[PDB]
């Protein structure tokens, strides 16, 4: 869906710009939730960037397997925030290693995973409007 | 949920009995779909029983990783049928190796995976009532 892709591009651009490189309410809540996750929560959970070791040869299937570990106990809003934040970290780490080409690929991976695996839970749980009420 | 667990126990008991060892409409459609999968489709896909090699030491996480391969591209009714049928085969193979104790465990794995990963898609796609209309 275009709405999921828009959220992905907005969050990734925000994270890249933050580091030096419509749906307004949803985008804002997402940006804020991602920031909170990075400041307080990222440190406690298993570091997924260590498990992926991204490069131009990295396949979507590899990304998919690592993200599955994130949702192993099911989906919830906090986990979706960790997922967006994980994608942001891969983009930042990609731009550092001079592989800016991987950004658009990571974006596609995220949108794809969202549409294929997370969308049903999102819609069944009130949609993004509900995320705003809880995290925004 | 209790409704998912009931479907799992009904299907497993049905498969076990077939090999010599409420929700009536859903249970019937599921039994019938599972039979069609075994008669027509099982031969046309990769054998997951080869990837699990079940024993009393087999962890849920192992089962989860194998099932994930089944839904790697997403969920649909036919894939859910393949999933029930896969659980049925593990139970049959467990009773054959004298490990009848694993049956209740496999049942719990299935109910768990259903509730944690498949339920949202099911509800967003018309619920079990829709499965009955299509496969029943
Ligand atoms: C309202 N105001 C105040 C605004 C606000 C707010 C607000 C509050 C709370 C918030 O988070 C709460 C925790 C969310 C989570 S994360 C999680 N697991 C599941 C198991 C699991 C297993 C393996 C790995 C991971 C993992 O994520 N590894 C990563 N590696 C990297 C590396 C780089 C970058 C990102 C990542 S992520 C996980 C993550 N589970 C939960 C949960 O809540 O259940 C929040 F985000 C925002
Ligand atoms: C109408 N009336 C007459 C009633 C009816 C009916 C009716 C109609 C259609 C039906 O299925 C259609 C195909 C469904 C599937 S399966 C599938 N892949 C994804 C890729 C993939 C990858 C790896 C493994 C598997 C896998 O499954 N491995 C297994 N190993 C074992 C071993 C033992 C036991 C079970 C199993 S399963 C798969 C399965 N994809 C699809 C799909 O349709 O997308 C059906 F079941 C019933």
UniProtKB/Swiss-Prot annotation, chains A, B:
Organism: Homo sapiens
Function as written in the Swiss-Prot or TrEMBL entry: Potent inhibitor of cell death. Inhibits activation of caspases. Appears to regulate cell death by blocking the voltage-dependent anion channel (VDAC) by binding to it and preventing the release of the caspase activator, CYC1, from the mitochondrial membrane. Also acts as a regulator of G2 checkpoint and progression to cytokinesis during mitosis.
Motif BH4 mapped to chain: 3-21
Record's GO cellular component terms: Bcl-2 family protein complex; centrosome; cytoplasm; cytosol; endoplasmic reticulum; mitochondrial inner membrane; mitochondrial matrix; mitochondrial outer membrane
Family listed: Belongs to the Bcl-2 family.
Result of altering residue 116 to A: No effect on caspase-1 cleavage
Assembly and binders: Homodimer. Interacts with BCL2L11. Interacts with BAD. Interacts with PGAM5. Interacts with HEBP2. Interacts with p53/TP53 and BBC3; interaction with BBC3 disrupts the interaction with p53/TP53. Interacts with ATP5F1A and ATP5F1B; the interactions mediate the association of isoform Bcl-X(L) with the mitochondrial membrane ATP synthase F(1)F(0) ATP synthase. Interacts with VDAC1. Interacts with BCL2L11 (via BH3). Interacts with RNF183. Interacts with GIMAP3/IAN4 and GIMAP5/IAN5.
Short sequence motif BH3: positions: 26-40
One Gene Ontology biological process: negative regulation of intrinsic apoptotic signaling pathway in response to DNA damage
Protein name per the record: Bcl-2-like protein 1
Motif annotated as BH2, chain positions: 120-135
UniProt motif BH1: location: 69-88
Domain of life of the organism encoding this protein: Eukaryota
Consequence recorded when altering residue 88 to E: No heterodimerization with BAX
Domain comment (free text): The BH4 motif is required for anti-apoptotic activity. The BH1 and BH2 motifs are required for both heterodimerization with other Bcl-2 family members and for repression of cell death.
Annotated phenotype, changing residue 78 to A: No heterodimerization with BAX
PTM annotation, UniProt: Proteolytically cleaved by caspases during apoptosis. The cleaved protein, lacking the BH4 motif, has pro-apoptotic activity. This phosphorylation is partial in normal mitotic cells, but complete in G2-arrested cells upon DNA-damage, thus promoting subsequent apoptosis probably by triggering caspases-mediated proteolysis. Phosphorylated by PLK3, leading to regulate the G2 checkpoint and progression to cytokinesis during mitosis.
Keywords for this protein: Apoptosis, Cytoplasm, Cytoplasmic vesicle, Cytoskeleton, Endocytosis, Membrane, Mitochondrion, Mitochondrion inner membrane, Mitochondrion outer membrane, Nucleus, Phosphoprotein, Synapse, Transmembrane, Transmembrane helix, Ubl conjugation
Tissue spec. comment: Bcl-X(S) is expressed at high levels in cells that undergo a high rate of turnover, such as developing lymphocytes. In contrast, Bcl-X(L) is found in tissues containing long-lived postmitotic cells, such as adult brain.
GO MF terms, alphabetically ordered: BH3 domain binding; channel activity; identical protein binding; protein kinase binding
């Amino acid at each position: 869906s275009q709405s999921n892709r828009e959220l992905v591009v907005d969050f990734l651009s925000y994270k890249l710009s933050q580091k030096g490189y419509g749906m307004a309410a949803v985008k804002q809540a997402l940006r804020e939730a991602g920031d909170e996750f990075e400041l307080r929560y990222r440190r406690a959970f298993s570091d997924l960037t260590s498990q992926l070791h991204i490069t131009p040869g990295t396949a979507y299937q590899s990304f998919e397997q690592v993200v599955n570990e994130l949702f192993r106990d099911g989906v919830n809003w906090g986990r979706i925030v960790a997922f967006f934040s994980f994608g942001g970290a891969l983009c930042v780490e990609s731009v550092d290693k001079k592989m800016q080409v991987l950004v658009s690929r990571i974006a596609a991976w995220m949108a794809t995973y969202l549409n294929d695996h997370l969308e049903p839970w999102i819609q069944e749980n009130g949609g993004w409007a509900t995320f705003v009420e809880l995290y925004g």
